[PDB]
Design a protein around this nucleic acid. Structure first.
Ligand SMILES: [Mg+2]
Ligand SMILES: [Mg+2]
Ligand SMILES: [Mg+2]
Ligand SMILES: [Mg+2]
Ligand SMILES: [Mg+2]
Ligand SMILES: [Mg+2]
Ligand SMILES: [Mg+2]
Ligand SMILES: [Mg+2]
Ligand SMILES: [Mg+2]
Ligand SMILES: [Mg+2]
Ligand SMILES: [Mg+2]
Ligand SMILES: [Mg+2]
Ligand SMILES: [Mg+2]
Ligand SMILES: [Mg+2]
Ligand SMILES: [Mg+2]
Ligand SMILES: [Mg+2]
Ligand SMILES: [Mg+2]
Ligand SMILES: [Mg+2]
Ligand SMILES: [Mg+2]
Ligand SMILES: [Mg+2]
Ligand SMILES: [Mg+2]
Ligand SMILES: [Mg+2]
Ligand SMILES: [Mg+2]
Ligand SMILES: [Mg+2]
Ligand SMILES: [Mg+2]
Ligand SMILES: [Mg+2]
Ligand SMILES: [Mg+2]
Ligand SMILES: [Mg+2]
Ligand SMILES: [Mg+2]
Ligand SMILES: [Mg+2]
Ligand SMILES: [Mg+2]
Ligand SMILES: [Mg+2]
Ligand SMILES: [Mg+2]
Ligand SMILES: [Mg+2]
Ligand SMILES: [Mg+2]
Ligand SMILES: [Mg+2]
Ligand SMILES: [Mg+2]
Ligand SMILES: [Mg+2]
Ligand SMILES: [Mg+2]
Ligand SMILES: [Mg+2]
Ligand SMILES: [Mg+2]
Ligand SMILES: [Mg+2]
Ligand SMILES: [Mg+2]
Ligand SMILES: [Mg+2]
Ligand SMILES: [Mg+2]
Ligand SMILES: [Mg+2]
Ligand SMILES: [Mg+2]
Ligand SMILES: [Mg+2]
Ligand SMILES: [Mg+2]
Ligand SMILES: [Mg+2]
Ligand SMILES: [Mg+2]
Ligand SMILES: [Mg+2]
Ligand SMILES: [Mg+2]
Ligand SMILES: [Mg+2]
Ligand SMILES: [Mg+2]
Ligand SMILES: [Mg+2]
Ligand SMILES: [Mg+2]
Ligand SMILES: [Mg+2]
Ligand SMILES: [Mg+2]
Ligand SMILES: [Mg+2]
Ligand SMILES: [Mg+2]
Ligand SMILES: [Mg+2]
Ligand SMILES: [Mg+2]
Ligand SMILES: [Mg+2]
Ligand SMILES: [Mg+2]
Ligand SMILES: [Mg+2]
Ligand SMILES: [Mg+2]
Ligand SMILES: [Mg+2]
Ligand SMILES: [Mg+2]
Ligand SMILES: [Mg+2]
Ligand SMILES: [Mg+2]
Ligand SMILES: [Mg+2]
Ligand SMILES: [Mg+2]
Ligand SMILES: [Mg+2]
Ligand SMILES: [Mg+2]
Ligand SMILES: [Mg+2]
Ligand SMILES: [Mg+2]
Ligand SMILES: [Mg+2]
Ligand SMILES: [Mg+2]
Ligand SMILES: [Mg+2]
Ligand SMILES: [Mg+2]
Ligand SMILES: [Mg+2]
Ligand SMILES: [Mg+2]
Ligand SMILES: [Mg+2]
Ligand SMILES: [Mg+2]
Ligand SMILES: [Mg+2]
Ligand SMILES: [Mg+2]
Ligand SMILES: [Mg+2]
Ligand SMILES: [Mg+2]
Ligand SMILES: [Mg+2]
Ligand SMILES: [Mg+2]
Ligand SMILES: [Mg+2]
Ligand SMILES: [Mg+2]
Ligand SMILES: [Mg+2]
Ligand SMILES: [Mg+2]
Ligand SMILES: [Mg+2]
Ligand SMILES: [Mg+2]
Ligand SMILES: [Mg+2]
Ligand SMILES: [Mg+2]
Ligand SMILES: [Mg+2]
Ligand SMILES: [Mg+2]
Ligand SMILES: [Mg+2]
Ligand SMILES: [Mg+2]
Ligand SMILES: [Mg+2]
Ligand SMILES: [Mg+2]
Ligand SMILES: [Mg+2]
Ligand SMILES: [Mg+2]
Ligand SMILES: [Zn+2]
Lengths: 71, 50, 120, 86
RNA sequence: AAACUUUCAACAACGGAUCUCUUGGUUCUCGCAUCGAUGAAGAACGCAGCGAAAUGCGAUACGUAAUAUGAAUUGCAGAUAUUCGUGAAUCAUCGAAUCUUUGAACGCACAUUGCGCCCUCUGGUAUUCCGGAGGGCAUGCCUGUUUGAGCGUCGUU
RNA sequence: AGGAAUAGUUUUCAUGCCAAGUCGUACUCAUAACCGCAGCAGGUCUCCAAGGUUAACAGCCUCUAGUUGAUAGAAUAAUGUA
RNA sequence: UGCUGUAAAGCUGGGUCGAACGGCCUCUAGUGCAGAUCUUGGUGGUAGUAGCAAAUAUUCAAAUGAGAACUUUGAAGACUGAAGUGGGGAAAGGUUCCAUGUCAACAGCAGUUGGACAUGGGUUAGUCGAUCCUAAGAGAUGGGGAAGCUCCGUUUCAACGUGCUUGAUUUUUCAGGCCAACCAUCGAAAGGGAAUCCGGUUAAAAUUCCGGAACUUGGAUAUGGAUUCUUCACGGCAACGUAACU
RNA sequence: GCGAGAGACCGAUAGCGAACAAGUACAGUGAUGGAAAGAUGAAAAGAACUUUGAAAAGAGAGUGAAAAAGUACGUGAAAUUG
RNA sequence: UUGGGCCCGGCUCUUGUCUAUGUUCCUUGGAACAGGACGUCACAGAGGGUGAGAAUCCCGUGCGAUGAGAUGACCCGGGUCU
């Protein structure tokens, strides 16, 4: 997941199973003030939903990861 | 199959989570009687129910 | 657990309670980021029970406002009504059960059960 | 060839999971559950299968509401809240 | 004579009888009357700092409130937890809440997490398109309200 | 039915703006991932298809690809199986 | 170790063991086993025996390792021979996929190897399928049977539109204008069906990711062009043509 | 069902099928069918350390009243075996 | 002959709280809850726990008492207002 944070400027999040790509896009905008280029979603074998969120060129996904504080 | 329903796929997720070995710190509890997980399941040996 | 105190919460407004709830959810969000590295982080339990307390006080506070609005009214929301049993809600009221025909009321009054004794 | 060779042609489920009881007794073509009788309003149960009643009756699940009727009845179905003693 | 076979004794094996227990069962007696559209019984899926099951619970998820009591919990860890006190733990008690997807199951449907419509608010230059938040739309029947239909029928022009 | 002259119409010509939700998606598909109690010589639907010989997609040899898997070692009486 | 009793049995020496038990007068019964092709559990001889023989086939060396016929690598010899022992899929399975570690059990020899065990990782879509359509059929509703569970019936002896379209109205009222043969619904991952390709990329995903280049549907909407004074375009005998062209 | 008190009852092949994560594991397409399985010790004090072994383990040693109690756990019969 | 409404009681139920007397001496034992000696309480010598058979170590038992909550036109006794 962290290789995606660096190379493709895409953030990977665990997301609620009931939420759609419109709600995920809104949530990251309200929490972290960031614009998503797209939201690709996926339900994992363990039953949780994974979202690949690519940010627009205005944002550097690595900077956001440091801001959240997990890299 | 590759083409599976959501209701099927959610049951297969629980079957994986129920197939774990016993966490080892559980054997340290006082008056503990569980020595191992007695509900293991192999895919080839015992089939589910979907 | 510990966390926030419910008696301090009952002295707060809607705006103050909602503001503290937002702070707790980002705190829980911040903890979930740190759980990636700790990975054992017992403080998460305290914040989760803090969210439950703040949510409880908001819901309870909002329920007497509706109760005060409907106080004395004939019709109130069904979740604010008494929750006994299905059969006991269908049961006759005290007034209806004690109803009596005017013919039946005249005979009870005219001939009450007397109080007496024997051997005198 | 009515045995082993014929047993190789079993890949069409007659039953799938039931929405009421989740048992894999829902006949696909009949659209009926062979266990609980779904979608009929009443539950399938027979007096010639008393052991089947044991398997699915009050107390075999959570009783998430009947759990507390005895405890609420014992207090006369109080309305209000408990008062702290002075 | 060895070996082998058989018998016996000792010790070691195999196995779990015997003895002794028992938070279980079984039966008798005494007492009580309390499920559900205010959504039951049951099902599925989830929930713990570290849990698979049983038990408990429902996105407030081994629990929130309240009352009582009065210093724990405990396998480890850990307080931005607590101790002459609104105060640890407790299905001790319990009167306030929360109560996922469902289920008589109620918008329609369901081998699909499929497809609508209405009201209020809101975002995208929007009564109409797309998104979000909250609240609604089942059937039979009763009383009442309103809107109607019939040369069935009454008065009048 | 609605349409002009000092102005009218049209997005079936060109260009430009926004959006497209939900669920599946890994892997086996069989002489070991399915069903036959099993890693069972059985059964189980379908797509692609090189060179030589030839009537031929037959049989035999080969290219690409994939395997070299089936307890092994030593002998070679009788009676067997092929 | 013995003693007593014809006997059923009782008592006793030694060893083991560790929490209860017995004698006598009575009461009571789920009260005595060699069998029942008895029941359940456990164990033999058979017996280290039958056997582990289909699908042409292996060998040398190095590496690793305590240990190598069987693991890896190299060299060779072979086979499947495109109707494959190849490359994908449907049903069915459900994590077997990938990486790391690993040999107690399993792979009827072995095992350093594995579809085993343990720990993690992994499946990205407006365009691929679902979803939409209807097929045989299934099946609600008004109803009609049946004591009833339910059976019949699918437009049926029914007052069956949660109608639309406009001009609107901002008066959230309306004015009306048209229609209502047929019209609940479910029912196809092989029928019908709006739209995506190439190159690259992962340990494991890709018509899904990256790069580039397209397309459809719904919606909004301006400019250019087109057309009109012969108002709703011109040309061609014609077949017909067109950037448009109620 | 709820809440109690009892017994000349049974004592883990008995007593309910279930004294245990029992209507559990598991079978069957399905209706259904449905087990086995209690006992170290007062207390894990669940054997530190040394040594041989690739390891499991073994031998010393240690704990314990007892290891003639080592989770293959009280007692440990018979069949069967060295 | 006589109506109705409230307020406190009693009874019933739930729930909270409260209560006598050795751990004295010797022996065995890892542990005394065993044996012996000396006792205490007993409307309490049921039962259980605690390192083995414990009235007297602990929880309880007997005797009763009480806080809080409920509940009852249709149980009664008092008040009190019409
Ligand atoms: Mg998006
Ligand atoms: Mg995309
Ligand atoms: Mg997806
Ligand atoms: Mg995972
Ligand atoms: Mg798949
Ligand atoms: Mg199989
Ligand atoms: Mg099954
Ligand atoms: Mg079979
Ligand atoms: Mg067939
Ligand atoms: Mg069929
Ligand atoms: Mg089935
Ligand atoms: Mg329930
Ligand atoms: Mg001799
Ligand atoms: Mg009993
Ligand atoms: Mg469900
Ligand atoms: Mg206090
Ligand atoms: Mg909630
Ligand atoms: Mg629930
Ligand atoms: Mg569904
Ligand atoms: Mg659903
Ligand atoms: Mg549908
Ligand atoms: Mg109604
Ligand atoms: Mg659409
Ligand atoms: Mg694939
Ligand atoms: Mg294939
Ligand atoms: Mg294939
Ligand atoms: Mg085979
Ligand atoms: Mg085969
Ligand atoms: Mg294979
Ligand atoms: Mg067979
Ligand atoms: Mg079978
Ligand atoms: Mg075919
Ligand atoms: Mg040929
Ligand atoms: Mg060919
Ligand atoms: Mg050949
Ligand atoms: Mg062979
Ligand atoms: Mg040979
Ligand atoms: Mg011969
Ligand atoms: Mg021959
Ligand atoms: Mg003992
Ligand atoms: Mg008998
Ligand atoms: Mg016998
Ligand atoms: Mg016999
Ligand atoms: Mg036998
Ligand atoms: Mg034998
Ligand atoms: Mg032999
Ligand atoms: Mg043979
Ligand atoms: Mg061969
Ligand atoms: Mg090695
Ligand atoms: Mg071999
Ligand atoms: Mg070989
Ligand atoms: Mg080789
Ligand atoms: Mg060949
Ligand atoms: Mg051929
Ligand atoms: Mg193939
Ligand atoms: Mg397939
Ligand atoms: Mg895993
Ligand atoms: Mg592999
Ligand atoms: Mg490996
Ligand atoms: Mg082997
Ligand atoms: Mg595995
Ligand atoms: Mg899509
Ligand atoms: Mg398509
Ligand atoms: Mg789907
Ligand atoms: Mg759709
Ligand atoms: Mg769509
Ligand atoms: Mg269509
Ligand atoms: Mg039809
Ligand atoms: Mg019908
Ligand atoms: Mg009709
Ligand atoms: Mg209105
Ligand atoms: Mg359909
Ligand atoms: Mg189709
Ligand atoms: Mg198709
Ligand atoms: Mg098709
Ligand atoms: Mg490239
Ligand atoms: Mg490139
Ligand atoms: Mg590139
Ligand atoms: Mg691949
Ligand atoms: Mg458009
Ligand atoms: Mg023109
Ligand atoms: Mg009881
Ligand atoms: Mg009872
Ligand atoms: Mg009693
Ligand atoms: Mg038993
Ligand atoms: Mg024992
Ligand atoms: Mg034992
Ligand atoms: Mg013990
Ligand atoms: Mg003890
Ligand atoms: Mg040792
Ligand atoms: Mg040792
Ligand atoms: Mg030793
Ligand atoms: Mg010692
Ligand atoms: Mg001993
Ligand atoms: Mg012994
Ligand atoms: Mg012992
Ligand atoms: Mg043994
Ligand atoms: Mg012992
Ligand atoms: Mg023993
Ligand atoms: Mg013997
Ligand atoms: Mg006392
Ligand atoms: Mg001593
Ligand atoms: Mg005792
Ligand atoms: Mg004494
Ligand atoms: Mg006692
Ligand atoms: Mg005692
Ligand atoms: Mg003491
Ligand atoms: Zn069912």
């Amino acid at each position: 997941a962290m290789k995606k944070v660096e190379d493709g400027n895409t953030l990977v999040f665990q997301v609620d199973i009931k939420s759609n790509k419109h709600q995920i896009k809104s949530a990251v905008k309200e929490l972290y003030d960031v614009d998503a280029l797209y939201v690709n979603t996926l339900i994992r074998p363990n039953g949780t939903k994974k979202a690949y969120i690519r940010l627009t060129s205005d944002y550097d996904a690595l900077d956001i990861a440091n801001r959240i504080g997990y890299i | 199959p590759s083409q599976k329903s959501f209701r099927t796929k959610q049951k297969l997720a629980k079957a994986q989570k129920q197939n774990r070995p016993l966490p080892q710190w559980i054997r340290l509890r006082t008056d503990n009687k569980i020595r191992y997980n007695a509900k293991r399941r192999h895919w080839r040996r015992t089939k589910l129910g979907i | 657990m510990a966390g926030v105190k419910t008696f301090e919460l009952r002295t707060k407004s809607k705006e103050q309670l909602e503001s503290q709830l937002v702070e707790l959810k980002q705190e829980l969000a911040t903890l979930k980021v740190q759980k990636l590295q700790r990975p054992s982080l017992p403080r998460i339990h305290t914040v989760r029970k803090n969210i439950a307390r703040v949510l409880t006080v908001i819901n309870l506070n909002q329920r007497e406002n509706v109760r005060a609005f409907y106080a004395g009214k004939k019709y109130i929301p069904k979740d604010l009504r008494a929750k006994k049993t299905r059969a006991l809600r269908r049961k006759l009221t005290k007034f209806e059960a004690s109803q009596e025909t005017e013919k039946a009321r005249k005979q009870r009054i005219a001939f009450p059960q007397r109080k007496f004794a024997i051997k005198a | 060839g009515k045995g082993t060779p014929s047993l190789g042609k079993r890949h069409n489920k007659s039953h799938t999971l039931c929405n009421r009881c989740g048992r894999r007794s829902f006949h696909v073509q009949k659209k009926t559950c062979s266990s609980c009788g779904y979608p009929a309003a009443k539950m399938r149960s027979h007096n010639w299968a008393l052991k089947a009643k044991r398997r699915r009756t009050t107390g075999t699940g959570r009783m998430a509401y009947l759990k507390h009727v005895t405890r609420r009845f014992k207090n006369g179905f109080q309305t209000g809240v408990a008062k702290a003693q002075t």
